[PDB]
Symmetry: C3
Subunit: 116 residues, 3 copies
């Protein structure tokens, strides 16, 4: 999985252990090994929702499977609660997109996942 979290909160409001705790959460929810999870954090960014600059997170989640309709309800419940607890965002200020990827469309260790 490859996760991007962008927020207009300042970098100092995203605790240093954010990536590591989000990696655990997704490892568990998506049944994926921790060494196959990358997290990007972009804090202090210009972001608006409804043209408002109130605190918000816009999140992208890519994974080779583990993203069925019912999985995504669970990932969303968990990620949203996690952003409430660690970022103090309201439940309605956490916007997530999922991308369900084929193994021919990911490259790792010098070749694609399908050709590993």
């Amino acid at each position: 999985p490859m996760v991007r979290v962008a927020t207009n909160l300042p970098d100092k409001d995203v605790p240093a252990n954010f990536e590591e705790r989000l990696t655990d959460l997704l490892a568990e929810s998506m049944n994926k090994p921790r060494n196959r999870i990358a997290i990007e954090v972009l804090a202090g960014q210009r972001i608006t929702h409804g043209a408002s600059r109130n605190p918000v997170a816009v999140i992208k989640v890519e994974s080779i499977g583990a993203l069925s309709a019912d999985d995504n309800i669970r990932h969303t419940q968990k990620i949203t609660q996690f952003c409430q607890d660690t970022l103090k965002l309201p439940k309605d200020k956490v916007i997530i997109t999922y991308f369900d990827l084929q193994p021919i469309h990911v490259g790792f260790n010098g070749t694609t996942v399908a050709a590993a």
Copy 2:
């Protein structure tokens, strides 16, 4: 919709009302409600096009529908004109990708849009 605008123009060159006006432009071109529109702006970024550092915008537009082939000509015309008027970019320096999403692949308010 969830829109990302990256530019090598400086942040001072992307006016403060940019996100507001883009939000209005998309609400109207897409017939989507203002409160379901997120805009990220990343200015002052390293970007090349044909390896040139001339001013350019690379834009991503995600939405659940409202992105048919025909819709996208309209969105492209309006977004490009808009970048011309507010960022002074040439018509041929505005690069846009559209991502037409299923509602099981979007998380908002703690669950998927499909489960709302």
Copy 3:
């Protein structure tokens, strides 16, 4: 092609000619013209892989075709070797996602690529 390279390496460690060389590498690997290749470099960024902050690149490659299973094998070998040589990244610290786009989902010069 529209390529995003994010890394936790500092900006001063990603050479000024990075985007030139990557533009040539992709024009050649994908048989795409240089003037239809955009590259965004985001360095200095928070990124973890396996929760580790060791040097890493997370790369997104969008293109209208030129992304078959076979093509992606070659793109991956090339970009990975290129990251090793210019960024001193280990072979297993280059994570790439490919997005194979329809021409109705790409806006350029004020209309879709499909309608050009």
